[PDB]
Design an enzyme around this catalytic site. Sequence first.
Site, short mmCIF file in Angstrom:
data_model
loop_
_atom_site.label_atom_id
_atom_site.label_comp_id
_atom_site.label_asym_id
_atom_site.label_seq_id
_atom_site.Cartn_x
_atom_site.Cartn_y
_atom_site.Cartn_z
N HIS A 1 26.36 4.12 -4.36
CA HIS A 1 26.47 4.61 -5.59
C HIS A 1 27.50 4.92 -6.59
O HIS A 1 27.68 3.83 -6.80
CB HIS A 1 25.37 5.71 -6.14
CG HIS A 1 23.99 6.08 -6.12
ND1 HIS A 1 23.36 4.62 -5.60
CD2 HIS A 1 22.80 6.82 -5.17
CE1 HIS A 1 22.47 5.40 -4.98
NE2 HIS A 1 21.80 6.30 -4.72
N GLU B 1 24.82 16.97 -8.64
CA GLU B 1 22.42 17.61 -8.78
C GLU B 1 23.23 18.97 -8.63
O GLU B 1 23.96 19.23 -7.89
CB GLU B 1 22.74 16.11 -7.90
CG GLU B 1 22.67 14.91 -7.19
CD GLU B 1 22.05 13.99 -5.61
OE1 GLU B 1 22.29 14.60 -5.41
OE2 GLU B 1 20.95 14.04 -6.80
N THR C 1 1.06 -1.20 0.13
CA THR C 1 0.34 0.23 0.47
C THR C 1 0.36 1.51 -0.28
O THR C 1 0.71 2.54 -0.74
CB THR C 1 -1.02 -0.12 1.62
OG1 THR C 1 -0.29 -0.30 2.67
CG2 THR C 1 -1.80 -0.50 0.66
N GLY C 2 2.08 1.16 0.35
CA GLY C 2 3.23 1.92 0.46
C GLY C 2 3.32 3.42 -1.33
O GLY C 2 2.61 2.67 -2.36
N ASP C 3 3.79 3.82 -0.98
CA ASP C 3 3.50 4.85 -1.86
C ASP C 3 4.75 4.07 -3.06
O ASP C 3 4.73 4.51 -4.53
CB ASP C 3 4.46 6.65 -2.03
CG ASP C 3 3.42 7.43 -1.38
OD1 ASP C 3 3.06 8.38 -2.57
OD2 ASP C 3 3.15 7.71 -0.15
#
Lengths: 485, 485
Positions: free
Chosen positions: A240, A216, A14-16
């Site tokens: 990463h 970024e 049910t999570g985003d």
Amino acid sequence: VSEIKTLVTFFGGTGDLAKRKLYPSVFNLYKKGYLQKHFAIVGTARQALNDDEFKQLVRDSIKDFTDDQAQAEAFIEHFSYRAHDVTDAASYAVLKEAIEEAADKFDIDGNRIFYMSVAPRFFGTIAKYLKSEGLLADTGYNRLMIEKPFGTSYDTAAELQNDLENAFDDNQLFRINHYLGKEMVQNIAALRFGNPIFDAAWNKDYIKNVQVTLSEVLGVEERAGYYDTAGALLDMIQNHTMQIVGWLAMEKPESFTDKDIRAAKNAAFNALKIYDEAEVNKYFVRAQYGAGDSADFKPYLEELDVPADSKNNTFIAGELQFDLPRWEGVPFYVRSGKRLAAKQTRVDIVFKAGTFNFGSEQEAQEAVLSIIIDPKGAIELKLNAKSVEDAFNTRTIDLGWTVSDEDKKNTPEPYERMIHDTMNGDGSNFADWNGVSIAWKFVDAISAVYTADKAPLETYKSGSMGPEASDKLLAANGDAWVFKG
Amino acid sequence: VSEIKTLVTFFGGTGDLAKRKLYPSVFNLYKKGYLQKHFAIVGTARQALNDDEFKQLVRDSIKDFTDDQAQAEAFIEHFSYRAHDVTDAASYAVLKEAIEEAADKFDIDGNRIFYMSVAPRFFGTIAKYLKSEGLLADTGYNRLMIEKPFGTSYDTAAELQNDLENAFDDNQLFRINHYLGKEMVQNIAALRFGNPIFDAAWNKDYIKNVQVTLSEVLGVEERAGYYDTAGALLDMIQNHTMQIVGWLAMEKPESFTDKDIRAAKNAAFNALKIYDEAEVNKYFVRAQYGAGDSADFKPYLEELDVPADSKNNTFIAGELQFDLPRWEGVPFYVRSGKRLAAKQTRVDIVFKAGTFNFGSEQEAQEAVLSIIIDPKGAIELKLNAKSVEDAFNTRTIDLGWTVSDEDKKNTPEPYERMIHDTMNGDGSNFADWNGVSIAWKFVDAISAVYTADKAPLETYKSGSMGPEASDKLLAANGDAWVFKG
Ligand SMILES: [Ca+2]
Ligand SMILES: [Ca+2]
């Protein structure tokens, strides 16, 4: 195509994240004809829901990915729900039924994947109970997908590994990593091993230094809460950057099987140097962004949810050393930060300048092989050639390539790739315990000095490419960052 | 810039070549500020002309190259004429005066260049008399520029060399060669020696085969007369192709001085294999163009001034072999022809495909380094990378570069480069006796079989890239022409 027979269970269904990326990714696999009939998707979470509600939620998830509603509906037919609390051992028996029911409904002979899209705190628990309450398929495979992060230090990660190893073997643990499953990152091996001129040149003799960049443009925005105690170091570097470095520093594998590829990478990781206080101050730079040329480019300390006394790092740059014959004396520079010149993810292999003198005013320079990962995939190669002048002289020229719109369309998004990888059992694009452990040991040694504040915290202008100290880091070995902004 | 003090004498000064290309090229050197005050240009030919007439002819020559008439006039002031017949020993004394007068007028301390823009028949004679009638500067240098062609066989060329060597030393003989003095051709050395990844790969271990291509779209047109007895073999192969090959096959020089560069090239030429009847039939292909898809693309035998019984070659393709450790077993394919797909002059270095298996459906392929000389200078490099597919697979990608408009402007035309080279004494871009002799020995062996007609004459469609046999030539070693048209 060759149909995939699998049963996926989404903890935190049910999570985003599930309805935002997971489900659409699984839908694409259906559209591409991979998942056909013998497959099921069991969602689960605390929130009670009757099938209709869940299926509708899924319908809302794959909205923007639907063209033929009928095709989508045929897909939704493969979903099922079961209200469940992860801390309740008995409650698991409910789930066992849901799974064994769906399995029967589509005749799925084992081949179960358990996606833990839940908080870190529940990873070990869920794992323990999948084994206890006989949720693991007695036939076929059983694989587990661990959402980020895998520990917050070496010890917490070792703990997590221990809990998981009580129910699974390492080659069954598929840890999620965004940048590792990116199209361009997988090109590295092809460029290197597919072209002998590069393969044979992948070492100290031809390479001056290697550079990895995770830039970024955006700032902290709202992620301040968790970011303030993680910083670039844990957010971008430990995971990463570190794994990308792995693809670059690996030895030449005995073959391209995930096993040999991994053994190759590990040979490098085991050679990586872990620093002490003095070394961290020498080979690394920690910084926090200040103000830009405008008001809306607020200093880090003026960001919402950021404590004024913070000495957290919004930027990290450092030199990695590998005690391997192949990399003897070859610096690996890494950098990642926020509020930098532009969003960019790239790798620059700088080759040693030739020693053959032409007698020209400008002698030969260093050639540069560049792999652009974000935003647009590109590959550039700066070569030495003759300048268009009356007298003989050399200059550098840029040979370039860019992904085409067709390549841009057919490229699978990260989650779809990772999930699809797991279904096939392809750990090639996944970090293993040895790699994760070393990365943590490596970063842990740095964090120690930072928390103790025995290293300076540089400051830099929002919009630049970092603090001066960054450039000075490379200048010390007579090097410089290829990407300038 | 550093002023050039020189005195140039143009034999055949009234000729088309002089006023069409030579003089403008010398004008550019003035505009670029190389030739300033201490220099003179003595024109000469049989046709009697008073200074005013000559100077006007020069004025007509540099018309389209003038912007500021006053600057041009200041240049024309440096020209002088003298009617003269080359076969008249006594008549030379007139010229000696003209030269010694101009020398005095601008205080030029020797440094004389003699450009023989006259028929081949007069090369030896003129040379002999320059020495006899004391025309050679008693101080400074004395250089001679021999217009094309240098012999029509080995023997005629050896004869010419002998006559010239009675008055000059080889390092003073500057033979004109169009393609050797082309901007892109000079890049070869830079690419190779300037980039270690290529330098160290320039050999049998990394290279599969080398390809040189001199393609022309036009047919014979009006050149039929002399072309019918020369063909592609002597017109394009023996001179342009052969010398370009030299830059490619040369060893690594002890330095970049013309001397070392030449010794390096000679090491290769001395290793080149000269063929017999059987070999010429195996390693070479001779062809003549037939009709195209239209009427205006008339067969070679229907061209004006072409004899119907002709078996002349409008196309030549062959394999060269170098008995040097570095090129042991590495084929050098060369091709030149008329009425082919398009005007193109390029070099394709095909690298051996890597033997590292990825398990992909499409394993690694051969990388290709390409140097485009005509029309637009370009450098391409086909590399192995990962294809954008769900399953791991490799494909080839083209990294490319093209000359910019700025590079296109500042690029010196051939004659200006050659003439300027000679003024500085830079034989780097010039063929030497050893190279010319070998090229001739090589071609002579082929011509023998062709004149004897002991080799077939293939035919091909106007517009194609040659006869099928051409492709079969390479297929025999499991190779193929990179440029397809
Ligand atoms: Ca250092
Ligand atoms: Ca052969």
